Backbone:
């Protein structure tokens, strides 16, 4: 199903995929082995669908939060870096791609959202979310807006929902409690309410997506946006005079973005596991490898110590790491995809006025908790009854669409 003797790589469309394809060319030049980089739509859903039938790319790139799930489903090969190779990347990046004791991906870079602002429209960007309504009125009088960011992906609204107490799964004593979901508590509700009120009072539009936000910021129509490192080179080319800074506070609490570690996994179905490791260890995770990708779209703070040090003085990366330190590294547990699906629905339904904030988050809490538990009890049934028809029939009924 997967062709032997070449490498197929999937990476998200906002990432430096042409830069990655140049690393693939260097590899073709040395080894004679061809490398095709693709950025399919809805990658993180596509990968488990094809990989489950034994198909898909040799290498999958995504933030580490989806990897525990892919690993629980048997879609990923355990990786085999030697100790010398492991020494080249920071310890906390290895930790993010460790699942049940096993390394399940190669860490590439640490990403967090920051506030991005146009210095010509707004020399002094707001410290607090609460100042945005008055700032938007001032800017509307000049034919501009205060803030636009992607409202269709809950990743972008999460920092605000988390500011006053929203959380995915409660983390204590080194473990996530999968029954303790923080999606409908008073702090989550307050943050989503603030966002919905911005929409109701006409300071933002519920339909705003990634491309709408990026164009408007890059063409100077809005004074602020919320985005990651991968967005910066488009802003460089647009010549807007921008700064990257700390997210505004909400109720005097820091915004708490969920932090991702962009990682590369090897497909368990892949007949090229050795070729894949040669590429990632010896071509991509080198100074020259990461530079080709970073020069395409910035990676953030990369996992490779040698090249991290080279980019450490960039104020935009310092701001990134200042926001990351206020937030938290996402869990990689298999229950994360349940969390994200439930919160996506809540934000879109609350924003568009289809449900109240209270109803939207009540149902997201219920759905997230129920789906997490279905993941949990599935693994338990397999431990009890093995890989068997009995356990297959229990699981089909338990996870019934
Ligand atoms: O919106 C939920 C979504 O958040 C994160 O996805 C990010 C990704 O980590 C970033 O690299 C960037 O590309 O934007 C994505 C959001 O559009 C989680 O990694 C992802 O699993 C989750 O569904």
Residues:
């Amino acid at each position: 199903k997967i062709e032997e003797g070449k490498l197929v790589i999937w990476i998200n469309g906002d990432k430096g995929y042409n830069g990655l394809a140049e690393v693939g060319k260097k590899f073709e030049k040395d080894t004679g082995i061809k490398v095709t980089v693709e950025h399919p739509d809805k990658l993180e859903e596509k990968f488990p669908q094809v990989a489950a039938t034994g198909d898909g790319p040799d290498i999958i790139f995504w933030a580490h939060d989806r990897f525990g799930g892919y690993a629980q489903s048997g879609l990923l090969a355990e990786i085999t870096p030697a100790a010398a190779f492991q020494d080249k990347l920071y310890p906390f990046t290895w930790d993010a791609v460790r699942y049940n004791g096993k390394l399940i991906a190669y860490p590439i870079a640490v990403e967090a959202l920051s506030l991005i602002y146009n210095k010509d429209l707004l020399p002094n960007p707001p410290k607090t979310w609460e100042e945005i309504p008055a700032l938007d009125k001032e800017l509307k009088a000049k034919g501009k807006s205060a803030l636009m960011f992607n409202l269709q992906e809950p990743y972008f609204t999460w920092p605000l929902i988390a500011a006053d107490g929203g959380y995915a799964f409660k983390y204590e004593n080194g473990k996530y409690d999968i029954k303790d979901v923080g999606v409908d508590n008073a702090g989550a509700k307050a943050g989503l309410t603030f966002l919905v009120d911005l929409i109701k009072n006409k300071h933002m539009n519920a339909d705003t997506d990634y491309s709408i936000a990026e164009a408007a910021f890059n063409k100077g129509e809005t004074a602020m946006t919320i985005n990651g490192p991968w967005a910066w080179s488009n802003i460089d080319t647009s010549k807007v005079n921008y700064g990257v800074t700390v997210l505004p506070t909400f109720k005097g609490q820091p915004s708490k973005p969920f932090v991702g570690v962009l990682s590369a996994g090897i497909n368990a179905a892949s007949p090229n596991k050795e070729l894949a490791k040669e590429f990632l260890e010896n071509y991509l995770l080198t100074d020259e490898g990461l530079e080709a990708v970073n020069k395409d779209k910035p990676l953030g703070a990369v996992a490779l110590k040698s090249y991290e040090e080279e980019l450490a003085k960039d104020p935009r990366i310092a701001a990134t790491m200042e926001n990351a330190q206020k937030g938290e590294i996402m869990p990689n547990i298999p229950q994360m995809s349940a969390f994200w699906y439930a919160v996506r629905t809540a934000v879109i339904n609350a924003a568009s006025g289809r449900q109240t904030v209270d109803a939207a988050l009540a149902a997201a809490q219920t759905n997230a908790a129920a789906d997490a538990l279905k993941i949990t009890v599935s693994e338990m049934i397999r431990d009890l009854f093995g890989d068997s028809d009995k356990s297959r029939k229990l699981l089909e009924s338990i996870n019934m669409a």
